Structure 1
Amino acid sequence: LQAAAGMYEQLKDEWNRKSPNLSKCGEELGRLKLVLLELNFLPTTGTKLTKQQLILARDILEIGAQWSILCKDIPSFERYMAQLKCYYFDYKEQLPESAYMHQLLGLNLLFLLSQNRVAEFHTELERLPAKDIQTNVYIKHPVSLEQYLMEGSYNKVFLAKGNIPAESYTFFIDILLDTIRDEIAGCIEKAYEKILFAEATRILFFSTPKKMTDYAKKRGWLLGPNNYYSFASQQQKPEDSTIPSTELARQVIEYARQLEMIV
């Protein structure tokens, strides 16, 4: 419907954790824009006076954000999410309110990580703290993951089991998971030669040998029903053996010419 705080928030509640809808809570989200032009003509200067206007601003864009996550469209979510953050920063978290902001916040953290935009991830980590204002249930998933992922205990991650508890998080968790699986998958090839199928499912973060066969094949190992780790592995181990000679010397003439000129 038409929404903007102080007189509406109907759609936030109607969107999920009541019944599934986005056919009212994102289909009608084009007329909310017209009040938004007014609201956004005021946080040019970020002051406490601007608050009143600022909460109404956020309200459409919280409903906006919410429709995008359920719909499974990452770009729409990103435009909506980004606004809420600058609208927190007006004495740094002036608005850390609403539990229809809570989910977004956690989602934003995992979102940054899936892209493997490391800079943005840290920027958000510091900007945000409302991880106990809105309390650790779904927001906990990126937090646990940061500690584990930095420590290098991949086992501990709580991202290959953060699929089961979800607000509508399950989608984000899955793309981020796929990124984790790849990172390990290329490395393991270099690591060792033809190892068991079972061993190659275990620490490849796979669920079955069938998932491993298809996933391994794209990567360049296990093209057949027999491991082909061996091509990759053998290349890495001797670093001190390689003489194409003239090719490797890399133009001795150039370095010499740079050197001679001064004297």
Structure 2
Amino acid sequence: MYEQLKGEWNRKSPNLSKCGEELGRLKLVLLELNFLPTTGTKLTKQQLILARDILEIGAQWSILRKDIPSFERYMAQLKCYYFDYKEQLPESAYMHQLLGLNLLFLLSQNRVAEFHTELERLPAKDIQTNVYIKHPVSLEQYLMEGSYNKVFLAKGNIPAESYTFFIDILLDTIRDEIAGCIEKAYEKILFTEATRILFFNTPKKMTDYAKKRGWVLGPNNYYSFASQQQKPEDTTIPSTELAKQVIEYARQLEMIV
């Protein structure tokens, strides 16, 4: 309408400092163009859905620059054009792509309970035969398995779809919890299983986790201390709070009397 915008739009720009000027430029043009959805006159769906699209690919370079509060900014603003009353809005082909990266973001931020309550809207049976429609929820049922071996064998089972590095952002952001839970160490665990379960031959787990856990590293074994070591109570302080219970039994039995 106001200008073309399509010259640098499909132009995959490596430099986002050029895209910051176009980005805040679109903030200045859309600044008067009513960010909230407008059902007036109904031909504004063109510029509102193209505004949706430029905030979608702007969200794509917002995660290409890896900017987290901007990411929930653009996703929280793109939900508004995703969640609207009029079903006359045609579905983006990249809508399920970006919602799939939204499920990636929920599993990335460990907000996955809100993923699990979000799981009603997503099998709306738009496609359901594309592997990316089924992919983050199958990966999350692998998470409820906890099976990373099927995920690690499943690394190259994703096609030339370019978000396998974003899947690697997920794998890199869950290994704190996988490595933390395998090193939960109730009794003790031995090194030679951690050879397989822990990652490749670069010793970054025993480097970072020596300064993260700060534990004892023994003769080729992983040691577990402070496990069920606690001395039981004196029974005196709970006898005092039981005495306070007796006071409140004299109260609640006999207050109005």
Query: TM-score when scaled to structure 2?
Result: 0.68
Residues 100-154 of structure 1 deviation map (CA, whole Å, 9 limit, x = unaligned): 5454222111112221223432455444558864974556542221222234544
Distance 2:11 2:164 in 1: 15
Distance 1:49 1:210 in 2: 57
Secondary structure, aligned partner of 1:250: helix
Distance 1:237 1:152 in 2: 34
Residues 168-220 of structure 1 deviation map (CA, whole Å, 9 limit, x = unaligned): 63564344334433334444445443432121243356665543442365134
Cα contact 1:46–1:91 (8 A) shared by 2:
no
Distance 2:241 2:153 in 1: 47
Cα contact 2:190–2:222 (8 A) shared by 1:
no
Residues 205-245 of structure 1 deviation map (CA, whole Å, 9 limit, x = unaligned): 66655434423651344556754532044449999999998
Cα contact 1:114–1:176 (8 A) shared by 2:
yes
**Pair 108,41 (structure 1): closer, same or farther in 2 beyond 3 Å:** closer
Residues 26-85 of structure 1 deviation map (CA, whole Å, 9 limit, x = unaligned): 431222223324542662559966533421321331232122111122222221122222
Is 1:229 the equivalent of 2:196?
no
Distance 1:185 1:239 in 2: 33
**Pair 153,189 (structure 1): closer, same or farther in 2 beyond 3 Å:** closer
**Pair 15,214 (structure 1): closer, same or farther in 2 beyond 3 Å:** farther
Shift of 1:11: 7.1
Q: Which moved more, 1:153-162 or 1:29-38?
A: 153-162
Cα contact 1:61–1:80 (8 A) shared by 2:
yes
Query: TM-score when scaled to structure 1?
Result: 0.67
**Pair 182,76 (structure 1): closer, same or farther in 2 beyond 3 Å:** same
Cα contact 2:16–2:61 (8 A) shared by 1:
yes
Distance 1:129 1:44 in 2: 27
Structure 2 residue runs without a partner (length 5+)? none
Distance 1:113 1:199 in 2: 27
**Pair 179,25 (structure 1): closer, same or farther in 2 beyond 3 Å:** closer
**Pair 42,238 (structure 1): closer, same or farther in 2 beyond 3 Å:** closer
Distance 1:238 1:200 in 2: 34
Shift of 1:158: 5.9
Counting only pairs closer than 5 Å after superposition, residues 9-158 of structure 1 correspond to structure 2 as 20-40=14-34, 43-45=37-39, 51-91=45-85, 95=89, 97-122=91-116, 124-128=118-122, 133=127, 136=130, 141-157=135-151
Secondary structure, aligned partner of 2:129: coil
Find the structure with the greater CA-based Rg.
Answer: 2
Cα contact 2:38–2:44 (8 A) shared by 1:
no
**Pair 149,207 (structure 1): closer, same or farther in 2 beyond 3 Å:** farther
Q: Which moved more, 1:183-192 or 1:229-238?
A: 229-238
**Pair 251,12 (structure 1): closer, same or farther in 2 beyond 3 Å:** farther
Distance 1:27 1:56 in 2: 18
Q: Which moved more, 1:42-51 or 1:236-245?
A: 236-245
